[PDB]
Design an enzyme around this catalytic site. Structure first.
Site, PDB file in Angstrom:
ATOM      1  N   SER A 161       0.953  -1.280  -0.073  1.00  0.00           N
ATOM      2  CA  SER A 161       0.023   0.187  -0.031  1.00  0.00           C
ATOM      3  C   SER A 161       0.793   1.248   0.173  1.00  0.00           C
ATOM      4  O   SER A 161       1.987   1.295   0.239  1.00  0.00           O
ATOM      5  CB  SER A 161      -0.860  -0.089   1.330  1.00  0.00           C
ATOM      6  OG  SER A 161      -0.318   0.171   2.440  1.00  0.00           O
ATOM      7  N   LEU A 219       3.053   4.345   0.096  1.00  0.00           N
ATOM      8  CA  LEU A 219       4.396   4.672  -0.532  1.00  0.00           C
ATOM      9  C   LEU A 219       5.178   3.551  -0.982  1.00  0.00           C
ATOM     10  O   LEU A 219       5.727   3.522  -1.980  1.00  0.00           O
ATOM     11  CB  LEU A 219       5.337   5.394   0.612  1.00  0.00           C
ATOM     12  CG  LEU A 219       4.763   6.603   1.245  1.00  0.00           C
ATOM     13  CD1 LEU A 219       5.544   7.105   2.239  1.00  0.00           C
ATOM     14  CD2 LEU A 219       4.462   7.554   0.263  1.00  0.00           C
ATOM     15  N   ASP A 274       5.052  -7.283   4.008  1.00  0.00           N
ATOM     16  CA  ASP A 274       3.907  -6.639   4.406  1.00  0.00           C
ATOM     17  C   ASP A 274       2.925  -7.494   5.301  1.00  0.00           C
ATOM     18  O   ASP A 274       3.414  -8.825   5.303  1.00  0.00           O
ATOM     19  CB  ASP A 274       3.048  -6.164   3.552  1.00  0.00           C
ATOM     20  CG  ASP A 274       2.371  -4.689   3.626  1.00  0.00           C
ATOM     21  OD1 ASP A 274       1.933  -4.675   4.882  1.00  0.00           O
ATOM     22  OD2 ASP A 274       2.299  -3.871   2.887  1.00  0.00           O
ATOM     23  N   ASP A 294       6.081  -9.117   9.835  1.00  0.00           N
ATOM     24  CA  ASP A 294       6.054  -7.961  10.839  1.00  0.00           C
ATOM     25  C   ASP A 294       7.467  -7.712  10.683  1.00  0.00           C
ATOM     26  O   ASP A 294       8.439  -8.597  10.755  1.00  0.00           O
ATOM     27  CB  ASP A 294       5.976  -8.477  12.096  1.00  0.00           C
ATOM     28  CG  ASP A 294       5.921  -7.223  13.216  1.00  0.00           C
ATOM     29  OD1 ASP A 294       6.580  -6.575  13.105  1.00  0.00           O
ATOM     30  OD2 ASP A 294       5.056  -7.368  14.172  1.00  0.00           O
ATOM     31  N   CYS A 299       9.202   0.874   3.976  1.00  0.00           N
ATOM     32  CA  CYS A 299       8.032   1.881   4.068  1.00  0.00           C
ATOM     33  C   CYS A 299       7.098   1.381   5.115  1.00  0.00           C
ATOM     34  O   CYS A 299       6.141   1.926   5.187  1.00  0.00           O
ATOM     35  CB  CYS A 299       7.410   2.016   2.585  1.00  0.00           C
ATOM     36  SG  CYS A 299       8.615   2.615   1.560  1.00  0.00           S
ATOM     37  N   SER A 358       9.376   8.078   9.220  1.00  0.00           N
ATOM     38  CA  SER A 358       8.168   8.179   9.635  1.00  0.00           C
ATOM     39  C   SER A 358       6.970   9.500   9.170  1.00  0.00           C
ATOM     40  O   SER A 358       7.581  10.690   9.075  1.00  0.00           O
ATOM     41  CB  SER A 358       8.050   8.278  11.382  1.00  0.00           C
ATOM     42  OG  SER A 358       6.543   8.342  11.557  1.00  0.00           O
ATOM     43  N   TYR A 393       5.837  10.359  16.642  1.00  0.00           N
ATOM     44  CA  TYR A 393       6.603  10.616  15.222  1.00  0.00           C
ATOM     45  C   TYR A 393       7.695  11.368  14.995  1.00  0.00           C
ATOM     46  O   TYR A 393       8.567  10.818  14.493  1.00  0.00           O
ATOM     47  CB  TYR A 393       5.419  11.777  14.820  1.00  0.00           C
ATOM     48  CG  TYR A 393       5.849  12.341  13.382  1.00  0.00           C
ATOM     49  CD1 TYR A 393       6.101  11.785  12.114  1.00  0.00           C
ATOM     50  CD2 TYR A 393       6.366  13.882  13.360  1.00  0.00           C
ATOM     51  CE1 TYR A 393       6.538  12.204  10.969  1.00  0.00           C
ATOM     52  CE2 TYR A 393       6.765  14.314  12.047  1.00  0.00           C
ATOM     53  CZ  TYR A 393       6.745  13.600  10.918  1.00  0.00           C
ATOM     54  OH  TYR A 393       7.451  13.946   9.753  1.00  0.00           O
ATOM     55  N   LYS A 413      10.950   9.488  13.564  1.00  0.00           N
ATOM     56  CA  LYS A 413      11.613  10.264  12.640  1.00  0.00           C
ATOM     57  C   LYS A 413      13.085  10.473  12.911  1.00  0.00           C
ATOM     58  O   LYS A 413      14.225  10.132  12.227  1.00  0.00           O
ATOM     59  CB  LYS A 413      10.915  11.442  12.280  1.00  0.00           C
ATOM     60  CG  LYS A 413      11.649  12.579  11.377  1.00  0.00           C
ATOM     61  CD  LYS A 413      10.888  13.740  11.299  1.00  0.00           C
ATOM     62  CE  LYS A 413      10.716  14.251  10.070  1.00  0.00           C
ATOM     63  NZ  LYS A 413      12.134  14.230   9.452  1.00  0.00           N
ATOM     64  N   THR A 456      -2.247   8.597   1.125  1.00  0.00           N
ATOM     65  CA  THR A 456      -2.174   6.881   1.150  1.00  0.00           C
ATOM     66  C   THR A 456      -3.381   6.817   1.915  1.00  0.00           C
ATOM     67  O   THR A 456      -4.109   7.442   2.413  1.00  0.00           O
ATOM     68  CB  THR A 456      -0.938   6.614   2.114  1.00  0.00           C
ATOM     69  OG1 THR A 456      -1.157   6.976   3.413  1.00  0.00           O
ATOM     70  CG2 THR A 456       0.570   7.303   1.774  1.00  0.00           C
TER      71      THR A 456
END
Ligand code: NA
Ligand code: NA
Lengths: 234, 236, 234, 236
Positions: free
Chosen positions: D10, D12, D31, D51, D77, D139, D150, D154, D185
């Site tokens: 999905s 990105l 994924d 995972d 991603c 992130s 976040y 990041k 997204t």
């Protein structure tokens, strides 16, 4: 048009960028202080404008030439000064050419690009700066290169934000050690030694790699207000 | 110990000079004016008239400092003081203005640092670890060209900090930069000064020049601070 | 009060900070996993709270102790993990202690500090983080220390901005190579060699120099949302 | 050349996978779901359920890649994809939530990178200069604890980029990070998505996942990009 102006476009990073832009279908004004012969050989989609970037009137006349060719949308500041060799006047000259010149070209170009029709009608243009460093420690004029680099980096995001309402992106490439004539005053084995200091790839950058990034930036609408180091992790 | 504080007769530079005088340094105030201010500071402060881009005038301010004692400290506040008043008073709307602002900030700070470092490098260390400390100020913030001149000047001063610290390390001279936000200096109506204060997250007020001076003295007193830029700006 | 909580306060950077705070007249809760004897020796203005910073209930009980002593206004996160020596579980432990623990203590403390009366009535308190790096290249767990450092740096400005309305400043110190027990597993001449790599001063930092900076940050109301490197330009 | 794209089913990651497939790479989509998506991608894409924090499951995705061809590319991603949907769907209002988000981002990216690098280091170089390239995502951005998780995630991914690039340089594996801003997204009502777009300076819209994928491919194709974080965010 689309027309690009590449300062320092007749050699090194600028030439490689000019060629990449021509390949991508743009017309290019090479704004430089010599290399008219080199630009002649590229054919009539590249044109030469003799100008020092620190001279407002000279820059304006180069932008005029660009306008006669088509719609001005792209600027790449690659004009630099001083060969890497092992003075307040010298400090001032580097700052004037690398920092003030880049601002001069950016501001004057932005004014014109802002007047164009956007092309889904999202963008008017893109201005790309070069933030250049000293090639090695104890290089003459290192503090001036660090000052002019820092200055170019520092103005990138604020100018991008001020030009947002005009749909002009502003980006900066910060190259590491590249194979250009600015290294030509050092003997060969010295340049080879410098290249081997780069973690990976352990060699000098090819100017085409700079040119490729510049084109990617032009082609990627989401890249704005950012500095991209292009330096093999050095 | 003697300090040279550029822009020392007003604002950040004056607040620094006062802190330095209280800490026991003698101070040469290097500025374009302020003889009366320096007279009011008393016998451990002396005035040197100089443009920070003028090599001969800066050299003479350094000569004065070395007459008074051993030169160990430089704080460059000229970029925020009397010297930028005219360069900014009627606004910054030209390429020529942009250039003049960049000149005083980058060239001025480089000139003061390069010449000061030459003198300080020749002193004896005081665990005999340090010869001296040079602190730069990364421009105080007008419109778009004004914003660009500020941001380029700040960037350039920041950019020089670590490389110069590295160069001077073998000489035992630390190089640091303070990057102030909105401060209450003579440079700045009460309502207009009030509005500026409110855009600072916390404390939501203009900085007190004494807060700059206190940081400068801490940098001087903390041997491990080197090659770094310290933002002093209330998270703005 | 004013009461401070210093995590990792029974050794190294934390101890030096605790002593500086006591000298400045604050009371201190040393939040740590051992060193009760060291804190006993400091006298009854320093109190020990046994807690792992990754354990919310444990941290909350240490903050409770601080509240019994006076008004909680200051936090310094100095808890760290792992001696410098020449595993996903190991990566996770460093991130959990150095990054998650610092957030845990910051968030829980902020909640309480926010409830205090400001002291001209401008400030409620100050929270200081430590962004720690690997001591040398090829140090085991370097990527984890770089990740947890980056994480602490990354959250500094955003958290300062979110706590502004509560009059709580948030700052971070990023130390270089300091003489603490975290280097004690390396032989002496190895530590001396590391110190000489620091440009100037070319030695290991004294924990008191960290403590002095922490106190300056507490005493300087304009320092907010910033990371200060304390590292001799390394 | 084979790539592993985590979160590849999905957003990105999918946009990246598609660009890679068009450039001639085979792709393992790593994924938590998306078998149908990967089936629709055709014979040069294969699906590995994993995972990113599970060492055995990631190892098996790598085994799959090396069955298909020579593993040279990893794009992480997962921090922006299906894997953070649940960790975020009902909001981020606890220390336990903060931890889980940090885990997937820092531990997940470190796990994928460390294991991928071990395989890639053993391949023959292709001027015989490069073995491979690993790209991380720092992130995508909810409230204060959400903002902290976040920003820490990041920061951590950013923080690892240069040190790991340096470590892997002798193995001829570049390490780069893309730091995206607001993207369109499945993660994200039209009005609410409209408001988010407007706070981006220019272009004042959500990013198209294809713009992320185009940058990832450029990084792959540009040998000189190493040890760097590239913000892709419209100057937000
Ligand atoms: Na800093
Ligand atoms: Na970047």
């Amino acid at each position: 048009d689309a027309v690009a102006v590449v300062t320092g476009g007749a050699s090194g990073l600028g030439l490689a960028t000019t060629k990449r832009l021509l390949d991508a279908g743009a017309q290019v004004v090479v704004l430089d202080i010599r290399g008219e012969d080199v630009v002649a050989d590229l054919g009539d989609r590249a044109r030469f404008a003799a100008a020092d970037v620190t001279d407002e009137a000279a820059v304006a006349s180069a932008l005029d030439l660009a306008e006669t060719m088509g719609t001005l949308r792209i600027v790449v500041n690659c004009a630099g000064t001083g060969n890497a060799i092992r003075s307040l006047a010298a400090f001032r000259k580097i700052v004037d050419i690398n920092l003030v010149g880049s601002f001069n070209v950016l501001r004057l170009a932005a004014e014109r690009i802002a007047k164009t029709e956007p092309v889904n009608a999202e963008e008017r243009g893109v201005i790309i700066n070069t933030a250049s460093v000293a090639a090695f420690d104890g290089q003459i004029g290192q503090a001036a290169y660090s000052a002019s680099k820092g200055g170019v980096v520092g103005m990138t995001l604020p100018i991008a934000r001020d030009l947002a309402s005009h749909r002009i992106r502003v980006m900066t490439i910060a190259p590491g050690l590249f194979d250009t004539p600015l290294l030509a005053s050092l003997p060969e084995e010295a340049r080879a030694s410098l290249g081997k200091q780069v973690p990976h790839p352990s060699r000098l950058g090819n100017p085409d790699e700079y040119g490729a990034l510049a084109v990617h930036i032009i082609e990627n609408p989401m890249l704005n207000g950012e500095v991209i180091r292009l330096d093999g992790a050095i």
